[PDB]
Design an enzyme around this catalytic site. Structure first.
Site, mmCIF file in Angstrom:
data_model
loop_
_atom_site.group_PDB
_atom_site.id
_atom_site.type_symbol
_atom_site.label_atom_id
_atom_site.label_comp_id
_atom_site.label_asym_id
_atom_site.label_seq_id
_atom_site.Cartn_x
_atom_site.Cartn_y
_atom_site.Cartn_z
ATOM 1 N N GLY B 7 50.169 15.970 35.519
ATOM 2 C CA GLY B 7 48.919 16.699 35.413
ATOM 3 C C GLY B 7 47.953 16.098 34.399
ATOM 4 O O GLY B 7 47.824 14.883 34.309
ATOM 5 N N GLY B 8 47.284 16.959 33.638
ATOM 6 C CA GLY B 8 46.251 16.543 32.688
ATOM 7 C C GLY B 8 46.797 15.672 31.581
ATOM 8 O O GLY B 8 46.076 14.866 31.010
ATOM 9 N N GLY B 241 30.680 -18.366 42.439
ATOM 10 C CA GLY B 241 30.618 -17.230 41.501
ATOM 11 C C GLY B 241 31.796 -17.128 40.545
ATOM 12 O O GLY B 241 31.644 -16.680 39.406
ATOM 13 N N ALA B 242 32.961 -17.549 41.031
ATOM 14 C CA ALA B 242 34.186 -17.593 40.281
ATOM 15 C C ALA B 242 34.178 -18.551 39.079
ATOM 16 O O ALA B 242 34.717 -18.207 38.017
ATOM 17 C CB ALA B 242 35.332 -17.925 41.225
#
Ligand SMILES: [Mg+2]
Lengths: 515, 351, 164
Positions: B7-8, B241-242
């Site tokens: 959970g949280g 781009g790499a």
């Protein structure tokens, strides 16, 4: 020969540059349903306010026949204009000059423009329309993109950066947009992708059209990359002007004040929005619009993670940002995509001094293996970070459900909200009341001759006795439980006080938000 | 995580810098198997949903997998040994290696065949103090390698393409992995050492539809924003781009070194040459002879590391056996690097 | 071809660059009573401490026959070394390469070195030996100088600057 002869010559040089790629390339542009780079600026900027710079820039690389051609403006118009009386830096790529390819000088123009915007404290509007790197220029093309990305990063949260995609945007061209704050994409004519369909087909065997790969709707709906979808270049230009009207020029200014609604009242029919059945949904924007000035709501990323709603509005003429669960979609749960959408929006708002107005109606997080395996922990944590970190005023209204971790994430008091209001319909619990009764009363329910009856009574008594908004209000977590018709007045008054809110944060180069 | 974490509870760990998970006993998830089954119909065990391997390998949430609690305690002690107490202090100096030499067999790690891969850790370990490398997130996005090491006793962080996994491409998960690590190193004043060998971004409909654009931009943002020293060594491929993303000069690296095996190009040499010579290939009385002639020629004349060195994008082309010595000296100079950033509350990194 | 073949090729390229303007221009430097750009550094710096950068830089301007010539280091050696154990940024103009004239790329190397000295907080030593602007590069050479002057002004009272 004479000065006037040199003026006549200058005018000829300019007229030639203004042809762009030539009459036939311009006809082709218009046949594609696209405007020219200059026609776009004309609509975008106040009449006659644009001052171009670097109009006479020419490329220098000579490779592969590049020494035998002139490329006007090197494929990009850069300058400064006004929008509604405020200075703005603009660039507009020209697809008619080598497919709007980015050369070295093209890139340097854009770098100069961004440097300038930052230095002068004014917004930047990029209109992209480019096949990508000018491959004939080689590593200089890459050098160019790189310097642009560095300028975008430096400017991030200092001046607002808005990108319009109004044609192709392929390869490394896609990352400057990504580094900007908001991306407007034009329907049918805009496309964005790192890798194109022919490369994808060669490597993965996947067969896909450009529109299905990276069209405007894809990025608005599937990928989460774009924030607006305009029909048209005209519509994209007016969208940019409206958006800017909400934003400051830079991070050292309060946002602009515009056409104040000074009425305090919330219409009676706000009582008719939430259904009687707590299992039924509704359109949270019907609540938003009965609370904000003039009923005006400017929605951001409306097609992506539609279980959460974000946008801009005004309260008493002053810009606010809206974050709201949408019960009509996935019962208003948080998930990976909604967490990303909201967290980035909130960080923008905080960076540019805009208050955050949250409307809460959520049962928790989306259950499913794909959420766990796709990193709901780290993605969900971004929303918590974003609110916790924000020092802008935070006003949260709880309309109905607020269970578990999602109660916390949705601008709770515990993350620093300055005021938390609850409608009498609010239902705040540590988890879903059925799941909580199943744990708390595990022994009583299992012992029982009729576990379902026993379970059913305990859930009802739990909802009544533990999940009403008065428990959180008894601790001061909720500042006030209010009549829904009082919502607008409360928000206005709180915001008036919070205009002078000063909050510090520990010194750091920056934080380490989960990514 | 030395047990359940449900959970949280999970969000605090997610908001910290590093998560160690103990193999069989640790489990972490927001929602458990019963609720998932009741809502989606999916039948899954707690281990398969949120065990330590799942979070180290699939979800990208955890950084270390300890076999037991003992090992997790030692692992934590070892991780702290690379880190300062706070952001106002220099990282600690430990067990300095002051030798300058890189071993001769660094020359035998890259294959002769450019289509074949190798483990980049064999290069890393022949450059860092004592060969010691402490890998972070080793099971997730294995096409990139990250971790801690030391140069002359001082902490450095390593970011390296792994050509033996998915050709050393960048993708959604590798971008996330490296970007967060870079931002951590920057915040705590640790130099960034990058090793480059990548042909570009992983192609795929799911990469695009998954937001490769916003995810990949996080890595550009991270390097660009960083004010710590950034030294980058290009071993082999660096395309498109790499190349830019992997600690390039253009994002503010202080020094860029290239081995003679480096191959820097605007895109794949094959794809570039097909476009640029499109006409000549289609007008030749044998296309595949001319196309193959031209591709080899493009690689030789345009993709060699000397083009980028001629512009100053690569500071030096070097003998691989000089790599440790260049890094050591660059880092001695960069100990006093001061760089300012615009005043802001914070930026707006893509998320 | 192989990695070791490429290392041998690298060594060829470096030896050639290290010729400067060639044996005859070097001999003339020495006859004039002058040391070469690299001999000066070798005397100035703690032995073995100098790291050159931008050795492989080449000029871009094609005017007036510049497209037919190679100009080693574009006429200037830049790097960082030590003097008595302390880091110092040094540049040393090479008169053997077109009279040590200042081209665009030559200027860009010095600008880069000044930027770096300032950022790292170390002294700069400039060894000047130059007929002036490379005339063939036109206004780019003036742009070059101007950017250097700008770097000297920002560095003034921040890091010590010594010129020879
Ligand atoms: Mg993600």
């Amino acid at each position: 020969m004479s000065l006037r002869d040199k003026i006549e010559e200058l005018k000829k040089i300019e007229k030639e540059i203004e042809q762009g790629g030539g009459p036939e390339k311009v006809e082709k542009q218009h046949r594609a349903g696209k405007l020219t780079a200059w026609e776009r600026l004309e609509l975008l900027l106040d009449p006659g306010t644009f001052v171009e710079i670097d109009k006479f820039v020419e490329h220098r690389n000579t490779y592969f026949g590049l020494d035998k051609v002139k490329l006007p403006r090197d494929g990009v118009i850069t300058g400064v204009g006004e929008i509604n009386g405020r200075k703005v830096a603009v660039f507009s790529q020209d697809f008619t000059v080598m497919g709007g390819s980015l050369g070295e000088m093209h890139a340097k123009k854009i770098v100069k423009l961004l440097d300038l915007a930052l230095k002068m404290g004014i917004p930047v509007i990029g209109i992209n329309d480019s096949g990508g790197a000018r491959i004939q220029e080689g590593v200089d093309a890459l050098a160019g993109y790189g310097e642009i990305f560095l300028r975008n990063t430096l400017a991030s949260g200092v001046v607002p950066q808005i990108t319009v995609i109004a044609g192709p945007c392929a390869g490394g061209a896609v990352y400057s947009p990504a580094l900007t704050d908001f991306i407007v994409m034009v329907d049918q004519t805009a496309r964005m992708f790192i890798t194109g369909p022919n490369v994808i087909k060669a490597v993965t065997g996947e067969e896909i059209s450009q529109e299905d790969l990276g069209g405007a709707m894809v990025h608005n709906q599937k990928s989460g990359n774009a924030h607006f979808l305009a029909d048209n270049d005209e519509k994209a230009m007016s969208l940019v002007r409206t958006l800017l009207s909400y934003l400051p020029s830079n991070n050292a200014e309060e946002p602009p004040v515009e056409d104040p609604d000074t009425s305090l009242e919330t219409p009676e029919d706000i009582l008719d929005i939430l259904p009687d059945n707590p299992n039924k949904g509704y359109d949270v924007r019907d609540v938003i619009k009965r609370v904000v000035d003039h009923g005006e709501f400017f929605e951001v990323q409306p097609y992506f993670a539609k279980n959460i709603v974000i946008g801009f509005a005004r309260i008493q003429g002053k810009t606010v940002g809206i974050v709201a669960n949408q019960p009509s979609v996935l019962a208003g749960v948080l998930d990976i995509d909604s967490s990303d959408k909201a967290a980035r929006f909130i960080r923008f708002l905080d960076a540019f001094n805009i208050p955050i107005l949250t409307f809460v109606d959520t049962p928790g997080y989306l259950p499913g293996v794909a959420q766990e395996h796709g990193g709901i922990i780290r993605h969900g944590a971004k929303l918590l970070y974003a609110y916790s970190e924000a020092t802008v005023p935070k006003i949260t209204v709880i309309l109905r459900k607020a269970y578990g971790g999602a109660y916390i994430a949705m601008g709770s008091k515990h993350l620093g909200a300055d005021m938390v209001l609850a409608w009498p319909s609010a239902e705040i619990a540590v988890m879903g009341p059925e799941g909580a009764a199943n744990i708390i009363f595990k022994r009583e329910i299992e012992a029982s001759s009729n576990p379902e009856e026993t379970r059913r009574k305990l859930i009802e008594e739990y909802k009544q006795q533990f999940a009403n908004p008065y428990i959180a209000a008894s601790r001061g977590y909720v500042d006030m439980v209010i009549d829904p018709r009082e919502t607008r007045k409360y928000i206005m008054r709180a915001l008036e006080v919070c205009e002078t809110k000063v909050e510090y944060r520990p010194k750091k180069k920056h934080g380490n938000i989960p990514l």
